[PDB]
């Protein structure tokens, strides 16, 4: 008088986008009539085996078939059935053969639609790619829509990669640091999903037009030197570019400051040596023209 | 490869089609667009190719707009 045995020969009669009709063979009841069956399932996205909802809500001991409901479209499933009598629940059956649910249109929008940056004449649109369990079908891609803020129609483009997270539009009509209305949708082989809400992304700005001036330097130690200049499209910081007397400007080291600090310190230099230093403004679009070079010794 | 951005005026529709099994010419993908706008009682105003696979592609994107 103990719990019943495990069912055998789990089979998928049919499967849809959200349902799966199963059948099984009964095991030994262990002298106690099997009163009910219960079903579990497992996907690559579940925490191991998890219980499922069924129709009927209660699968009786006389039921050798049932319909599992509320599944996720385009997801690979496997099922198992457990017998249960008056004494207690029994051992689970062996897993069914793997079966992928049918597909449908995507029901979600790309998360964290945003953008900005790039070189002048560019508009950068980004988004978090949709994870596999929400794509709901093969041929998953994206549709990107954008326009200058306040325009009538839209510019749209199909981005077919399911892992696409960025679309870059470049055109001579793109004005620098100008606002654009942007919305991103999704699609698969069965159709198109919904667009996200309209957000405003700014186009790329222009690199600094002028160079800093009055570049001067003085050593602090055998390896450290203090550099200062004069301030001047916006600027987010300055880029130092330095090399020693026996080198060339192109094969040099770089150092970037943030803000309007106007001063910086260079470490790692050699003592009793002459170096050349260049200061250059920058923003997100790149650098501007450089200042005239200064030479200092350690 | 980067897909062309197509202009979609008001009451126009943006459509697209692709199949990873196919590898068809530009002229084929044009006729796909012209017919799809046609059986919608709309004209073809803008289109471009998707997914290159020599002058052959796996998909197409286009814009249909009402007639007259």
Author numbering:
A (entry chain A): 598 to 829, 836 to 901
B (entry chain B): 124 to 176, 178 to 192
Sentences from the paper on this structure:
Human APP appears more closely related to APPb than APPa, so we crystallized the E1 domain of APPb and the FN1–FN3 region of zebrafish CNTN4. Surprisingly, subsequent structural analysis indicated that a proteolytic event had likely released the growth factor–like domain of APPb so that only its copper-binding domain bound to CNTN4 (2.93 Å, Rwork/Rfree = 0.241/0.281). Overall, the CNTN4–APPb and CNTN4–APLP2 interfaces display many of the same features found in the cocrystals of chicken CNTN4 and APP. As is the case in previous CNTN–APP complex structures, the bulk of the interactions includes main chain–main chain hydrogen bonds between two β-strands: W751–Q753 in CNTN4 and L129–P132 in APPb or L134–P137 in APLP2. As is the case in the CNTN3–APP and CNTN4–APP interfaces, the carbonyl oxygen atom of S126 in APPb (S131 in APLP2) forms a hydrogen bond with the hydroxyl group of Y764. Furthermore, CNTN4 residues Y784 and E789 form hydrogen bonds with E141 and H139, respectively, in APPb, and with E146 and H144, respectively, in APLP2. These contacts are absent in the chicken CNTN4–APP and mouse CNTN5–APP complexes. Overall, the sum of this crystallographic work indicates that the CNTN4–APLP2 interface in zebrafish is essentially identical to the CNTN4–APPb interface in zebrafish and the CNTN4–APP interface in chicken.
